[PDB]
Symmetry: C3
Subunit: 128 residues, 3 copies
């Protein structure tokens, strides 16, 4: 039982991604945000009682590495319930290195999202 | 089953707060510290086997935002068992912003402590 | 059920330590690394589904306080499954203070490793 939060400035990509995630049995609750601020605002109202939550954050957006700065300010107890992933259509080796260096970014995923790739990846980070 | 740790330079406020927490069924074990050093010293001797622990830290005190620096040095495994709250009689919007920015400070609570407000807040951060 | 990871540039110390840990009933799975890079590489491939893992890191080695920098870059979900300890033959009060200040270093242990000392210490950090 996982919640999904998508953060993307592209309205087309936002709704499309939401559609695909719902189309699979990967999740039944998709929350969508068009801005980092609104995404951060929602997270600041959450406690450690929230379900296993996956956050899909777009790279070329505040952007991705400004979002993580505000994200790192959230209490550790709520961050522990969350697995944050970076998504992007363009992927140069410089982006990969930065995501790797960023503690909150688990992995950089390519666009469009590969559902079987992510479903397997969820086994690793949300076990049992 | 929660432990409570109060850190306040005001001896009157320290014992008074301890009294109120014991007066309610919110907790049965209240530890009180008159100094950040003694509070930090006690925490450094703890492991990840400690009960769900709430820490009430006074703002105008090392002070509050020097205590958190030493607090951030504790192992993550013991910090995960702890929910840290800032308490103060005076609350200007500048204090709120800083507490919000500080990852270890979950929320700034006003003095005197509102037990029903905190009891509800404990449901969020120490679930089940 | 714990996994043990030893990181030591000394090949003699590495295999010797591995031998002692296996000699006791403290663990049955010891992974050994002769370099911080190879140790970090292995950790970067792990998820939050890994067993309770103890990491023994040698001080005079990248060294110990460069290893922790790369270690701090790992996702918090995998770090929560790990207890990291610093080990060294020489122990001046300056080393103790730095280990104390480093959030990821739980405790500095002397060489050679005292198995009963560590076994008791594991009760604190890997409870139940």
């Amino acid at each position: 039982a996982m919640d999904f939060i998508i953060v993307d400035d592209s309205v087309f990509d936002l709704f499309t991604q939401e559609k695909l995630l719902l189309k699979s049995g990967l999740t039944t609750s998709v929350r969508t945000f068009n801005s980092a601020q609104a995404a951060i605002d929602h997270l600041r109202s959450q406690g450690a009682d929230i379900p296993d939550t996956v956050i899909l954050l777009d790279l070329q957006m505040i952007n991705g590495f400004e979002f993580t700065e505000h994200y790192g300010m959230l209490p550790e107890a709520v961050r522990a319930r969350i697995r944050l992933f970076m998504i992007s259509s363009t992927v140069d080796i410089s982006d990969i290195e930065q995501a790797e260096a960023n503690p909150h970014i688990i992995q950089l995923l390519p666009k469009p999202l590969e559902i079987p790739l992510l479903r397997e990846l969820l086994k690793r980070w949300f076990p049992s």
